[PDB]
Design a protein around this ligand. Structure first.
Ligand code: ZN
Lengths: 159, 58, 142, 103, 218
RNA sequence: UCGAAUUUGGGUAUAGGGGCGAAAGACUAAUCGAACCAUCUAGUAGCUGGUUCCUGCCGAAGUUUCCCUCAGGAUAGCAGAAGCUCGUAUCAGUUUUAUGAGGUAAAGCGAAUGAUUAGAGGUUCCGGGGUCGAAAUGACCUUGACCUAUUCUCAAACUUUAAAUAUGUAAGAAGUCCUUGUUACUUAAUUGAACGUGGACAUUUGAAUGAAGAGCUUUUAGUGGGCCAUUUUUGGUAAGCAGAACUGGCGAUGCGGGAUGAACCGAACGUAGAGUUAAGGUGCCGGAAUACACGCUCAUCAGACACCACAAAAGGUGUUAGU
RNA sequence: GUGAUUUCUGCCCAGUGCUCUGAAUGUCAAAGUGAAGAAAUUCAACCAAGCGCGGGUAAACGGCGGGAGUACUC
RNA sequence: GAAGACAUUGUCAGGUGGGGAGUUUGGCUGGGGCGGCACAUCUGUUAAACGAUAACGCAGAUGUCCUAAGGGGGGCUCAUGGAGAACAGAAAUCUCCAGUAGAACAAAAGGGUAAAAGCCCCCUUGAUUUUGAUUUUCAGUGUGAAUACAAACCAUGAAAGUGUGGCCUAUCGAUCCUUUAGUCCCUCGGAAUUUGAGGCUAGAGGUGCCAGAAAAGUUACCACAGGGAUAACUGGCUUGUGGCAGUCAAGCGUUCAUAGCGACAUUGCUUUUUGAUUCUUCGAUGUCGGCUCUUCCUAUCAUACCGAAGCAGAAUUCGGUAA
RNA sequence: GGUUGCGGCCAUAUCUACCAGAAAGCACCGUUUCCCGUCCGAUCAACUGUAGUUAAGCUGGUAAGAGCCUGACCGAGUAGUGUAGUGGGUGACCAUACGCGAAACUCAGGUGCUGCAAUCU
RNA sequence: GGGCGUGUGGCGUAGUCGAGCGCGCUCCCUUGCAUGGGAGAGGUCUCCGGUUCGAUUCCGGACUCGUCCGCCA
RNA sequence: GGGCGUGUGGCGUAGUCAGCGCGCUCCCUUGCAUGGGAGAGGUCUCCGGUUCGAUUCCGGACUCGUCCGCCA
């Protein structure tokens, strides 16, 4: 018959990695999570308690509950034609903070600093990001850079 | 009389007809599943805060 | 439980079955198709272990028949008196509840105990009734 | 399996409310009484003509039963039940396993 | 009793090697892979000629055996048994299956058709690619015309299209002819049973001096 | 066959789960493996057939789960109708930026596991065969193992490495910062946790593009046999074969082209006029150049357009161009 | 049941049936008997036939095997 | 005359009772039947690097086992190889060195584990009580399994801590009925006491066809509703198999590859074999063989004209145009 | 800068073979009455810091060292792959257009950094 | 038709590449309800080719025998 | 073609992750009858895996004996 267990098809997903097996380092236990933090989920195969299901591997969610050794995380799961709210109790070995959130907060504080310093002059702050604009005019010189002519190479076996 | 077993054909079209609405998020989400020792203190903290604000703006 | 179900086709030769609430041991199995379209029927010929009678039953192959639990146990004689054997278990337990065999096995066992061999007795349990089937002699540990 | 004859466990007997000593037995069902309502209804329904009026089960599949231990608190005589997993062999006599000895 | 090779010409399935999930395969028909003067040294045979595929297909082990016998027989008849070194550079590891049907009259009374049609192993084949070498021969420059004719005779036993290319390398090595010549004039090559070991600028100097003494004898 | 176990008239007896049978399930009023008549009875049917006027607008499904379920239902989905609360947003089958996750394609095997070709150098209290040896944990060759440095080839259920395409989250006002209130939680401790008071930051308020209104609720129809094409892919020698993944179609759809055709190419449709085209074509059928230009081919079975209606290995001082 | 005459109808009662004037507690209903109980009731003893034990029966249904030695013997 | 309170008769009770009555006699399925379980589940793979994903796909497994093989703590390091020591050698015990796990962890497989999750020792029962929340399957129902807490009460350790069975992924079961534990609480409805009975909360007795009927056959005497969703003809796709034809040439042929043949390989054709499939037909396409009669194909047996020979003649063989 | 105690990242830190180490600190080292544990005061426990020694541990250095780490326009815009065509080819498969882009190999360089507290010629 | 195996003295039967026994009867010796003993004869190992040095033995082909599976509705 | 069973000393076989009995060959004892004790004898059909260990547990292969292979 068919087989769809709780950890089916999780072979390479829950292998550890090359040459970093063994016990886990103490930074994962010393990291501090608060309610509202945004965290990434990546399971550790060395810890069998508080494991996430294989669906939530690589998923990103929001902390809603902090307990003794675990964290409650909220994920949005697509079921059919809508997203449902899923609450997960995961031990802290299987989560880490999302770095995109702290990058955005750094952008917020630097952006507020720019607005605050330029508010003393009113110099059209222009605080929105802009994407890659087309590159403008330039003059390239041939002083020591005379062009070298290239041609297609004929065919050879090369074995 | 064998028949077709399973397919996922047309399913994403059916979903994306009037489909993939994100759930409505709210200020003050539900406190169910939150730790009872936290909620038991949170009730008294909000009660004291409401009493202090009522006495301030009475 | 004392007894457990099984399928007729799952049964095979030298196995125990329950026929008419008797522990029986199969000697013959034969399957013949009922009709060309239909399923085969199993005809079972078996011998009661305790009484030696021949009992037969035919059933559908998909039908479930009752099967006993038969345990064979090894003991040493202590005495044969009044038709009741007295046996001695490993770790020193003793039972006298077994009745002595009544046939040529019982006669041979009685003569062997009279002329003084150390006799090893096999007694079987199935469905709450107890009997002795065979005896040997201990080649070592005299 | 093997289960010891005594066990220190919780007793919710309204005076203990703690772990006390318990003597264990195996649960036996007890005889089905007459004048139970279902038995009276069954006898009334089976009387007369019509033959067998209720199903009788045939397609037995289990070979084991779940064992139930009856715990009895030694102080205040209150009783508890707890079930175990399915086992073909069960015993309450404690013959402890011993490790570094011969076959 | 063997099916024609057109039923197994193309690489239609995933590779199916003999393993602990097969456990019952027929042995390969080709068994000898290196022949001629296989114990010859490296600078005995400077010229190398390749039979190389132009198809993406499967070559049967029977066809490999037949082509090996044909090329070996022709070259030993025309040029001597120890004037060349031939090496078969493909190995049949793919296993071919057959769902055997009964060829009896009224077979459908007991055939069951396509139900449970997973096959049984009956043969071995080697999966080749575009520009993959099947055969490689090294010899002296006086045997070019006979090794090209030997490979051309062997090409008839193979399905698909194959090319005969005279390589620019020295023998069975991977350097060019003048590169190997300017390497062997120094002592930084040293012969083995058939191949040659090369000097590198890495490693411990003591080992690099107990081996390869003539290059350091500068 | 024809003097009888004969043929036959009339009278009479046996009545329907009953009769009668020298036995065929035969006969019992053209009815018999259970007669005929009336009633229950308009018996039940998940099964077959049919189902009656017009126009307008919207518009499917052959999929999930359970069922003595597999020609049927329930349930979710797809669809319609009625709307309701609001007024440009708590949006998006899309991109960018930042940040995750993955073990396929590829690659690798002088990297682990496993398979595998060939020699070379060593190890014999530490192999086996021969020959020389009184024999010898003797010798000399040879052959096997094991080790060392190489070498050839591989892996759906091998792997150090590792894409592309898909995929999670974030890009603020429900935000940031400052100050200090509550608590029975927590701390050695106004330490922290959570929710707060008061104050400051507004249109470049925090990337792009578009928004066709955004959000919400009730109720119910039909459907729950699908099939085809490109790409990935499984079983099979293969199949207009069987089974999957993503998308687009046909079913449900006409129109121009492919002579012809459900699915291919182009393009989707109110009634008309003018112009321009798509795919396909311009000797004649047939609307449109027997146009222009450079070559090739002469077939005593030429060739002529994707899907598509077939041809291979091997050859040829046929002819052309090359190395 | 077999199917004139003639000539014969062998072996097997383990099974399934059928049949005994055998022997007698194993199974063992209702009524009846005894005990306990305040009673409903519960528990026992006793317990007919038939099963179970012991015989017969194949012109009853039926059945009529293997391994060695040298048809025969084990 | 006989018989006699026995037969008979009436009502209950046990046996016997296809003589008769009523009914049943699974599903999936490359047609059905036999076979198997793909019917409830688990591991790896197919599976196309989120998730999901089929086939009677491949390789296997489950209906158990364990008072320790659960919980806590402490000490130690395994498989293997080398070198040694009386009996003692290939394998008995002891000693040292090397040893990233090449061992072990109940079982199938895959993950995980080295002052441990392994081996040995010490103490125990958290395999306990009370109800909630969450994850997987999913309708976001049930069942099973699991995760993190709260309120108690415990175990262990110096302690931090750890423990709500087994290192993780499988190891299992509704309504009704019976029975057990708890509350010793509620009710027996004219009022009480005591038995008895019925309720509430939590378990057990089991449905393996595993969201859970109580169930043997035959029909060649057969019937009905349907089905080309489905088999037994032809036809159509395919050509494994059957038949026929090539290419290459190790050899046979005294000598000599090819007069005639031709191994090991390999490319095709045909639909006069048999399979495979299920597209058409089940409100019917008359189903073997023979007889009769016409036409077509050529892969030519004979006749016509030729080429080759291991063609002297005769006879024969190979081949061409030829139906 | 050396050393110790507790660490973070967990080989640029590991492994093999040599060499060096002032001061201080670690270490080996001396002892068995007491607590405690062993077949064995070898490990563990306790006592002294006395009798001694850098021999080892430890730290650092060396090696065209093994390994590991970083980079390259080194291989290679190669393999692979998203999209497109009434493109080629009997087919197998392959070119082109708009995009993304490896691994092995080769070469070059490197061989622990650092937090808190104490202490040192 | 195809597949698989088989072939020894007059008969049965043993054969690893280096034709033996038993039975029939030839003779001799030796005996009622007729024996035994001793020396005998007896093969082109089914046939034909190649390998070897020599094939019963190895291989290829042919013959023969014995098994197994096969036409239609 | 498929499925099931089968091989243990000469025979009967049994079995825990090779035993007897009857055969065989000796020796001893005592009839009417005997009996006892020794031995030679088994790669558990074969080959692998698993397991401390396998007759036993599993897989593959051989032999033999069975049972099906039907509707058209
Ligand atoms: Zn108590």
């Amino acid at each position: 018959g068919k087989s769809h267990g709780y950890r089916s098809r999780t072979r390479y997903m829950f292998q550890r990695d090359f040459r970093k097996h063994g016990a886990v380092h103490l930074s994962t236990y010393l990291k501090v999570y608060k309610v509202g933090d945004i965290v990434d989920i990546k399971a550790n195969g060395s810890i069998q308690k508080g494991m996430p299901h294989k669906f939530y591997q690589g998923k990103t969610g929001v902390v809603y509950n902090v307990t003794k050794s675990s964290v409650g995380v909220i994920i949005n799961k697509m079921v059919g034609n809508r997203y449902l709210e899923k609450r997960l109790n995961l031990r802290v070995e299987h989560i880490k903070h999302s770095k995109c959130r702290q990058e955005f907060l750094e952008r917020v504080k630097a952006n507020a600093a720019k607005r605050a310093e330029a508010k003393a002059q009113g110099v059209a702050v222009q605080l929105k990001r802009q994407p890659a604009q087309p590159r403008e005019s330039r003059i390239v010189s041939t002083e020591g850079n005379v062009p070298q002519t290239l041609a297609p190479v004929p065919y050879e076996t090369f074995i | 009389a064998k028949s077709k077993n399973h397919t996922a054909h047309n399913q994403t079209r059916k979903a994306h007809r009037n489909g993939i609405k994100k759930p409505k998020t709210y200020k003050y989400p539900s406190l169910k599943g939150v730790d009872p020792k936290f909620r038991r203190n949170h009730k008294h903290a909000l009660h004291g805060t409401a009493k202090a604000l009522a006495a301030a703006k009475k | 439980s004392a007894t457990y179900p099984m399928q007729c086709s799952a049964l095979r030769k030298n196995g125990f079955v329950v026929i008419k609430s008797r522990p029986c041991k199969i000697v013959d199995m034969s399957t013949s198709k009922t009709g060309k379209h239909g399923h085969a029927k199993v005809h079972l010929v078996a011998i009661d272990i305790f009484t030696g009678k021949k009992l037969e039953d035919l059933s559908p192959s998909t039908h479930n028949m009752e099967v006993p639990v038969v345990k064979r146990n090894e003991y040493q004689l202590l005495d044969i008196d009044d038709g009741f054997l007295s046996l001695m278990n490993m770790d020193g337990d003793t039972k006298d509840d077994v009745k002595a065999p009544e046939g040529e096995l019982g006669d041979s066992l009685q003569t062997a105990f009279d002329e003084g061999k150390d006799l090893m007795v096999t007694i079987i349990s199935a469905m709450g009734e107890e009997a002795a089937i065979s005896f040997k002699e201990a080649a070592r540990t005299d | 399996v093997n289960v010891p004859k005594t066990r220190k466990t919780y007793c919710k007997g309204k005076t203990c409310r703690k772990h006390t000593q318990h003597k264990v037995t195996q649960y036996k069902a007890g005889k089905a009484s007459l004048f139970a309502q279902g038995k009276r209804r069954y006898d009334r329904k089976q009387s007369g003509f019509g033959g067998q009026t209720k199903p009788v089960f045939h397609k037995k599949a289990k070979t084991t039963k779940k064992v139930v231990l009856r715990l009895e608190c030694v102080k205040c005589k209150t009783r508890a039940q707890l079930t175990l997993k399915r086992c073909k062999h069960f015993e309450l006599g404690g013959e402890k396993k011993q490790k570094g000895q011969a076959l | 009793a063997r099916r024609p090779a057109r039923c197994y010409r193309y690489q239609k399935n995933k590779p199916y090697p003999k393993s602990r999930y097969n456990r019952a395969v027929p042995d390969s028909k080709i068994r000898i892979y290196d022949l001629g003067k296989k114990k010859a040294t490296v600078d005995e045979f400077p010229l190398c000629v390749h039979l190389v595929s132009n198809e993406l297909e499967q070559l049967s082990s029977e066809a490999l055996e037949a082509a090996r016998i044909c090329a070996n027989k022709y070259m030993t008849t025309v040029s001597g048994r120890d004037a060349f070194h031939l090496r078969v550079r493909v190995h049949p590891f793919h296993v071919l299956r057959i769902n055997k049907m009964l060829s009896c009259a009224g077979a459908d009374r007991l055939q069951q058709g396509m139900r449970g049609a997973w096959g049984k192993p009956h043969g071995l084949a080697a999966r080749v690619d575009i520009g993959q070498i099947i055969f490689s021969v090294r010899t002296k420059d006086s045997n070019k015309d006979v090794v090209v004719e030997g490979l051309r005779r062997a090409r008839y036993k193979f399905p698909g299209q194959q090319k005969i290319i005279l390589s620019k390398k020295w023998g069975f090595t991977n350097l060019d002819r003048p590169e190997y010549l300017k390497k062997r004039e120094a002592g930084e090559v040293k012969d083995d049973g058939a191949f040659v070991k090369f000097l590198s600028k890495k490693g411990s100097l003591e080992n690099n001096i107990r081996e390869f003494p003539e290059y350091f004898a500068a």
